[PDB]
Amino acid sequence: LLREQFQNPSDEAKPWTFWYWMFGAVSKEGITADLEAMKRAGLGGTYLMPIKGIKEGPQYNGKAQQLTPEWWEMVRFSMEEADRLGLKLGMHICDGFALAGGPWMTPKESMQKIVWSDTIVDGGKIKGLHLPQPEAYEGFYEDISLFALPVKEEAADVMPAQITCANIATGNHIDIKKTVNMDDAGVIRSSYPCYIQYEYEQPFTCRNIEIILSGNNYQAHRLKVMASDDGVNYRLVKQLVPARQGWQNTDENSTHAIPATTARYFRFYWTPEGSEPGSEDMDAAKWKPNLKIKELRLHREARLDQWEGKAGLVWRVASSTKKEEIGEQDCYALSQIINLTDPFERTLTATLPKGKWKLLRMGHTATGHTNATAGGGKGLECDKFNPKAVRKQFDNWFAQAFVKTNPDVARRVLKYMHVDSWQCGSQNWSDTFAAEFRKRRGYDLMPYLPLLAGIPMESAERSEKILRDVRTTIGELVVDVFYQVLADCAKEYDCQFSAECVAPTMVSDGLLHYQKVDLPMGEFWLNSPTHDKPNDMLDAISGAHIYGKNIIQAEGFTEVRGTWNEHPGILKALLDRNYALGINRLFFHVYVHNPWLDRKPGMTLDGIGLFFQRDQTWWNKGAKAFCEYITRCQSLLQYGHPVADIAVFTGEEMPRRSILPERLVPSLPGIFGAERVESERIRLANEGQPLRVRPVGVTHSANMSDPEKWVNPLRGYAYDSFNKDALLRLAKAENGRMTLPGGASYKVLVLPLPRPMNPDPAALSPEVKQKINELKEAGILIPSLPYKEDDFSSYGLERDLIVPENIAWTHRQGEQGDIYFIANQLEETRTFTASMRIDGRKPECWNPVTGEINADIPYEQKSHRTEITLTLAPNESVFIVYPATGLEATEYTVTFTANGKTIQRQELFDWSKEEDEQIRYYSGTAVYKTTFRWKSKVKEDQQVYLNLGKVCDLATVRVNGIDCGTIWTAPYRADITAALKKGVNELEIEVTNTWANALKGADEGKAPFDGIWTNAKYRRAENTLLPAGLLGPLNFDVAN
């Protein structure tokens, strides 16, 4: 029954934590203390993951380097203690937090890429010729083919150039030293509009520019190319366009094609005007809009536009190459190419026709990626397309946890196998790739292998059709090999399989892998706009919904710079909007193991939060009460199936992933509303490229999308993104709706306009065209775009929930009835109407903070909907469920637990404004004791609240020794009804703040007690003491 799930939730409803072991510094005494704290807070389990080793942190004197006998003894003891306490465990598939590496992997067994070497020679008879050796990682390299291409032009690929620059920006304060300049090594820097000029001795013909960088630089890809024969009259060649790109973009340079241009002078003009704001698919646009280029390489030999990404070496999306850029005469036919593979530190002997020929020697080598955050378990990443390599990774780490510990205990407690978010670049080859390509795509890749160096063949269109097939195959192999093999291994060891995202680092369909896993998992960050991953969150939730996975996990509260002012009151709105998106099992990031019992707050992940661990000031009472709210919420939010009326198709480009709401605004302007259309015009215009600092010390693009401003963006409908695999393999028409196994059922199917991640757009395959037609004939609404009405009520599809803005919500339904989660996102008390798409059933209001149920709230039935009036306090949330006078106190005694000080006061006070330093700089818990008089006996159906006024930051209330609650969020009041008596009552309130004030104290030689230490170095920029204590005033509230 719903009422007993809410009141006595199951173990599946409890949140979990990540548990990080730092630098091999681990102790048994800390393990016991940590696991007991976790059990007392009400967590269900933890994922044990060690991060770095003694080399990275020698000062900590760690005795538990990964994979040593001493380390395995800590893992065994942890398992033993988890069993005693009734907690469960998981571990990741490698040391560190990403991804699938270890010291047992050789270069041959690691991720592979196609590499090559060039040389030009005269034809006729060739004899014992040595060829240049391609890139070989640690000396590993293997030949595949050797091609001979008849040169298109005899002139050289590059020529010498005199390089100069010129500032063109005028007026006002222009820091003259930040105008364009070139250093000793040729590196070009600028913060103001400028040109860079290349002068050739004789006219040069340029077909593309290879842009080479030091790190990332969005602005480098926005140059405007101009050319001149006479040194004064210049003509426009091309405005360059940045390719879509993710945070791991540095493994390859970028080639921008132009129309073939013969000139003595090339000018590259730059301005920051017209820049796009940062996002997950233009990651470098997050950073300051300054220009920085290591080298521009102007090439003569023809190449496809942005080929590095199109060959799958790196995660990128760009437009197909225009005919103006690569025409018939720029491509090679198959009959022109002479394959010299058969003719054998090797040499070549054979004979060519007369003329000059390019000797293109192709092969493969390792990409060079490692599980970089590992300690003892660090080495090369496994080949993701090789099933024996993938199995080997499993056997050498995760499988060993059932052998090198106690095997019977391991089998009871270690029930979860995790793979985290991908951080190992991309790969475009393996020994099996040709054959896999052959079965799946229906033709041979091998004669076309020079496409993977960007050398065009037959036509531009034909070259790019095949390169898309290479990319498609890459993504298919991530799922059918790496995930498939790991899923077999997990089932063999009786483990559940959780996984986070593959996008935006590895070429993939970002949703596709979620079919092979039990527990899709997303990520959401606290106070970290440059590192948040809302598109990851939508990949995991969309994947779960379309592939029928009921439990959706999330790595929550990850904080790029923690500053020790975080407590549960300021985490609630963040959590609730991610519940509205559709997660239902939270994993806290992060609980770090503190091996010392006399250092507080102790060891952290170099100051990366959330600092969620036993030595937090608010752990004992605050972590517990938060986790109780979380468990009540998650009991209802795992019930039944989620409701979503709209499916949005993710297309046929590669790579691909779920679609962010902002990118749908041009398709559905009516649904989003005019105010959203207008605010988006202004944001994307991005006038002045404004900067924001958040957190302390992280300067970034101010107009980047903020997920807090995208609550209920379709104004009462919900959507999932939806891929070709689900369309072709799972979708079925039933009663005018598109259904999928596991409970998804959509009335609308959107085929969005061309968009930044699908700009061509990629043509729909005949099979996709066929299924869409079928679904349309069966009653599924395929709207005509742009869709301009406010909603879909014209077609019989009303909004699910009608509420005002800044109200986050979700809807679940099953045999026992319907549930709406409704949450206030503002720091304001608000009263509003909520209108739900439910006809003639009685609603109830269930309160997740307190566990109270009000089964008889007022409501009105109107036009076959149900309306209620809700009052929500700041950040307050509620579930709507449908079945099928001043205090007058004596002298306060206030006792500061951590340092034993006690004082006597008549009036309440802010700790941070006291003259005594041991109070002024205090962080921790203080116990207030007083008495008050109650006039009359408590009547029947009379309810009394003690209102606490302003609490900094949480308070537990006790009346005549009876616990009346831990108060951590609005409204700040406790129900004292049952504890009251006539006469004098005893009043005790325990109040706890955050660590900020004590750390500022300790930093300045004014620590308020002994034993303060942390490796977390970041602090609030403001340099102020925060408000602290029970500020009041205290008041009674009597009602019925």
Ligand SMILES: [Br-]
């Ligand atoms: Br870049």
Ligand SMILES: [Br-]
């Ligand atoms: Br897009």
Ligand SMILES: [Ca+2]
């Ligand atoms: Ca992650």
